[PDB]
Design a protein around this ligand. Structure first.
Ligand SMILES: C[NH+](C)c1cc(NC(=O)CNC(C)(C)C)c(O)c2c1C[C@H]1C[C@H]3[C@H]([NH+](C)C)C(O)=C(C(N)=O)C(=O)[C@@]3(O)C(O)=C1C2=O
Ligand SMILES: C[NH+](C)c1cc(NC(=O)CNC(C)(C)C)c(O)c2c1C[C@H]1C[C@H]3[C@H]([NH+](C)C)C(O)=C(C(N)=O)C(=O)[C@@]3(O)C(O)=C1C2=O
Ligand SMILES: C[NH+](C)c1cc(NC(=O)CNC(C)(C)C)c(O)c2c1C[C@H]1C[C@H]3[C@H]([NH+](C)C)C(O)=C(C(N)=O)C(=O)[C@@]3(O)C(O)=C1C2=O
Ligand SMILES: [Zn+2]
Lengths: 146, 217, 50, 49, 66, 105
RNA sequence: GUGAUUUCUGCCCAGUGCUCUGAAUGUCAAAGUGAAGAAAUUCAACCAAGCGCGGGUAAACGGCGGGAGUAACUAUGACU
RNA sequence: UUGACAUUGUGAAGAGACAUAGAGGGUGUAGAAUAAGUGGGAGCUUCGGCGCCAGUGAAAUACCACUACCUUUAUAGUUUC
RNA sequence: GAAGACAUUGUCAGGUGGGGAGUUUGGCUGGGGCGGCACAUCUGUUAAACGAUAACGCAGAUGUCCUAAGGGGGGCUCAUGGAGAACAGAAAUCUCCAGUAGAACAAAAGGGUAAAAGCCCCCUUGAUUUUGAUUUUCAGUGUGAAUACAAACCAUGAAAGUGUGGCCUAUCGAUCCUUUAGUCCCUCGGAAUUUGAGGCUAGAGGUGCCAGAAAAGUUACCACAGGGAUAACUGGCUUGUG
């Protein structure tokens, strides 16, 4: 008895210039969403370097980065999945696939979005929620009425 | 290294079938229970372990299963013989709470249909999943009798809030070697689902229905 | 870089104190029997500028 | 000039980095505010009162 | 469990001989253990009482003695 | 990719030189023990003054790893390794696909 | 650091620094402790500062955007 | 800067942790119910009855173990502040 | 007089540490820089009817996907159009006729394929073992890909046969280090036994700058060796633009 997993790092290395706005980037072993970018020439026969400002989505924390524009950067392979909420249990929301129903591990989102989700489920009005999965961590990001 | 091997389990399962098969022969079919317990797993912090394993034989052979099916699933249930629970009495049942409580508490395993599985939350309520019983999907191609045996065999190790878990392995009159193989397979499945494996298993009890709780580890 | 001004300041030479016009060190009378048990009388005779 | 001080270099006269040096810094780095628990104009005014 | 009311013990406060009631009253202090003298905890004390209670009569009801 | 848990393939054992049944697992790498000669050489070379002495790899370009299956024969308990190509996703014994089943979005 | 006198020094503590009698070990070396072994050894807990989590500080480094609708000429928009 | 060992001897007092076996416990509704939880369980036994079914409730009562948590008892001692 | 087995000091271990020390800061390129990858590959054309053939020529594509979309066997014919049949219409399903492929064959383009290489069904694991030979790039080296056999053991089919992955052309990686599999194999060199370690045979962990360094800037304060192989004047050829 084992668990099969092909070796797949959740980062494709791409490029400092190929990272764009609303992006996904790995700054110091955390997923983050590129919210600001700027190219900047350094010298007089110099090259351009990229300054990146991004927000870590699982904590919502601002992380910055500086690199020469010709260097490679890790890009997380995020997967957004659209699931169905059965019931909000003791902080750990119960979730449903297209047919399967495992997904019982996602912490109910602690923000005001999750509080309004709790109010919705409490007066019923059943929803489908959107969950992001990236580099080992998963989080509910956005509720949506079916 | 597998901390639990066959030999000690051979001896403990000899003494288990000893106490069941002559000492207190009862008036109903008892079931072997593996009760496991964790040490370092904090339920609020770690990733929840969840997993089902199809057994090579049968546990409790008289579980009470209910079929949420439409036409083909319902007709197959009428052919085999399992209580089929169609959308008819489901929408005739919607306007209550006590009756859904009665249904969920009365039949223990629920089996569903692919085209019913999405509005089971709607038509029913959260009570089934809250109890720990969500209807398992069954396709039209899938033979209903075979999948009924599947669901009467599947063992589920899944953390909910606590650190003691308990799973029925099998009956008490089936043969010694398959009981040994099953209990070893279930232990190994638990250890495989864990993070630190044998380091974080701490409690390993086998029982049937009564006082004697025959420890393995 | 270069050794900066405060490091040079601690390394002595130019950054010492100018003690040419200074009087003696301004210290109290040392402890003895007269001050420890009774009292001793001195006379302040010249107040000057350090 | 940048050789003579941490603050140093130019094209514009500015500190460049934060002027609050650590307490645990080394010689040649302690050019600024040495272990500043607070900065800016103070009001006010108690330390131990 | 700390059970301080059995950890402690009672003591009897008495008055100077100018008054007539010899018994003033009772107090309570922790047991005299090591490194902490309950007796010093007793000397650190000032107590308030009524002169009507000290002199018996009601003519001295307003007056209070520390 | 999906590969079954069982496979009838050639066995190299001297008691069974024919096609026999094999269970299919995945090769997970070993513990990288501390007393290997290269590790002892690395410890002695890194000890002292001088800093890092051998190169450390930085410019990763490939995301995938070739999967290699460990086959254990069910009779002679002999093992073999079979290499399968670069696949991002891998499931040992997943559900078989259905030819013409009703799509479910 | 700014650069006489007069007048004033607005907002932002997210980032980067700096700081703390904030909180629990989440991670955490050597030495020490326990289990297995014939030992070399392996695996555990316990684990200092630090890092991380929290608070403060801008006469610390610094920063200080947009887009719509809206008033009897029209136009702008006090306002939303 | 922090920790260990050495220099480094001689003593107390109070706490905390570990160390193995027991014992006992866990009362907002509603339910007649003193519902810590999970799991099997339609039988159970002491031969009285209990339990299921009924009702009730967020979850059920017999037979049962297990899990942590709390309290002490036995508690050689080790170890830290 | 004060402190007191604390602190200092000695040795290890962790943190911090541009204060300081070394070192680095790819290539191609109608100058260099920014851009791009023409740096490892694949299709059509340029390419001048064997082969070879350039440009930062043109139009595009690759770093995947599949236990079936691999292998064998069998039944059927595919786009499209016409005529019809309740709801039903332009188009839902069913027939009939015509239908050389105008469809499909995972993906870019080209080629190939009709009682199939397409679409459904049945069985399977030739996507296996042992090494050799050959073709392509080529130095006739390596890597990758592929071809035909041999000795086995299999799958399929009634059988002939076919099958050593994808109908063909692309889909990928040396030394050193680590790890796994094989026989029951060799060595630990005074002689033995066990763990341990080192070997032999085959794989994987990866070098995309893809025959494979471990690597950020600035310099108008600059320095050196050079270069008209190379830019900023003039001259020259050309005249789009004026
Ligand atoms: C850094 N240390 C020396 C320290 C110092 C002080 N106070 C001072 O500044 C000292 N000044 C004095 C000596 C009082 C004059 C301190 O006040 C503290 C601490 C330690 C922290 C440690 C905390 C810790 N976790 C949360 C990081 C922890 O695990 C515990 C614990 N449960 O054992 C703590 O005690 C801790 O939470 C804590 O409270 C600390 C202090 O209070
Ligand atoms: C504020 N003081 C009272 C304090 C309290 C606690 N304890 C707590 O905070 C416990 N409270 C909780 C519940 C954990 C939040 C503390 O835990 C601490 C400290 C301060 C320092 C004391 C330090 C001291 N040093 C500076 C000479 C010392 O005696 C030692 C030592 N030789 O053991 C220290 O290591 C000390 O740095 C230290 O650890 C402290 C604390 O952590
Ligand atoms: C009684 N507590 C408040 C205390 C006081 C002092 N110092 C004093 O008495 C003087 N400080 C005052 C005057 C009260 C401000 C203390 O000096 C200390 C301590 C506590 C201990 C705590 C120790 C503990 N260890 C054993 C795990 C702990 O929790 C920590 C920690 N990681 O925070 C310690 O560091 C601890 O070892 C420690 O250092 C303490 C003290 O030194
Ligand atoms: Zn075999």
């Amino acid at each position: 008895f084992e668990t099969a997993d092909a070796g797949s790092s959740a980062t494709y290395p791409m490029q400092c210039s190929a990272l764009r706005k609303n992006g996904f980037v790995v700054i110091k072993s955390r997923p983050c969403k590129i919210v600001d970018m700027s190219t900047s020439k350094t010298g007089k026969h110099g090259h351009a370097k990229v300054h990146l400002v991004a927000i870590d989505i699982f904590t919502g924390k601002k992380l910055e980065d500086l690199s020469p524009s010709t260097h490679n950067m890790e890009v997380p392979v995020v997967k957004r999945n659209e699931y169905q909420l059965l019931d909000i249990d003791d902080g750990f929301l119960s979730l449903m696939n297209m047919d399967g129903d495992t997904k019982d591990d996602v912490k109910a989102p602690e923000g005001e979005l999750g509080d309004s989700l709790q109010t919705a489920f409490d007066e019923g009005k059943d929803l489908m929620v959107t969950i992001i999965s990236a580099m080992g961590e998963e989080a509910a990001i956005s509720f949506k009425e079916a | 290294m597998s901390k639990i091997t066959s030999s000690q389990v051979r001896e403990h399962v000899k003494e288990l079938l000893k106490y069941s098969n002559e000492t207190k022969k009862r008036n109903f079919l008892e079931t072997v229970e593996l009760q496991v317990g964790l040490k370092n797993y904090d339920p609020q912090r770690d990733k929840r372990f969840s997993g089902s394993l199809k057994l090579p034989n049968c546990p409790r052979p008289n579980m009470s299963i209910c079929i949420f099916g439409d036409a083909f699933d319902v007709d197959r249930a009428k052919s085999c013989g399992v209580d089929a629970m169609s959308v008819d009495d489901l929408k005739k049942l919607n306007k209550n709470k006590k009756l859904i409580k009665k249904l969920s508490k009365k039949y223990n395993a629920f089996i569903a249909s692919e085209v019913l599985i999405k509005q089971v939350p709607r038509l029913l309520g959260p009570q089934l999943s809250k109890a720990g019983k969500f209807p398992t999907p069954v396709s039209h191609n899938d033979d209903l009798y075979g999948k009924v045996t599947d669901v009467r065999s599947t063992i589920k190790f899944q953390l909910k809030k606590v650190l003691c878990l308990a799973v029925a392995v099998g009956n008490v009159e089936m043969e010694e070697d398959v009981l040994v193989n099953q209990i070893l397979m279930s232990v190994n499945f638990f250890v495989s689902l864990l993070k630190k494996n044998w380091q974080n298993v701490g409690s390993l009890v086998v029982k049937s229905s009564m006082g004697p709780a025959f420890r393995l580890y | 870089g270069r050794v900066i001004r405060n490091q040079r300041k601690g390394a002595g030479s130019i950054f010492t104190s100018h003690t040419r016009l200074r009087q003696g060190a301004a210290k109290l009378r040392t402890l003895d029997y007269a001050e420890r048990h009774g009292y001793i009388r001195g006379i302040v005779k010249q107040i000057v500028h350090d | 000039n940048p050789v003579d001080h941490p603050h140093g270099g130019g094209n514009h006269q500015h500190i460049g980095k934060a002027s609050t040096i650590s307490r645990g810094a080394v010689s040649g780095q302690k050019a600024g505010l040495i272990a500043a628990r607070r900065t800016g104009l103070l009001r006010g005014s108690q330390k131990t009162q | 469990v700390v059970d301080p009311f059995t950890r402690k013990e009672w003591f009897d406060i008495k008055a100077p001989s100018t008054f007539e009631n010899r018994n003033v009253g009772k107090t309570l202090v922790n047991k005299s253990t090591g490194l902490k003298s309950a007796s010093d905890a007793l000397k650190g004390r000032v107590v308030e009482v009524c002169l009507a209670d000290l002199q018996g009569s009601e003519d001295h009801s307003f007056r209070k003695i520390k | 990719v999906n590969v079954p848990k069982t496979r009838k393939t050639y066995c190299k054992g001297k008691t069974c030189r024919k096609h026999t049944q094999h269970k299919v697992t995945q090769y997970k790498a070993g513990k990288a023990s501390l007393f290997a000669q290269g590790k002892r050489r690395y410890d002695r070379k890194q000890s002292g003054f001088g800093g890092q002495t051998k190169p450390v790899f930085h410019k990763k370009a490939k995301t995938t790893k070739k999967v290699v299956l460990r086959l254990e024969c069910v009779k002679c308990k002999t093992r073999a390794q079979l290499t399968l190509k670069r696949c991002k996703h891998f499931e040992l014994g997943g559900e078989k696909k259905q030819k013409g089943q009703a799509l479910q979005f």
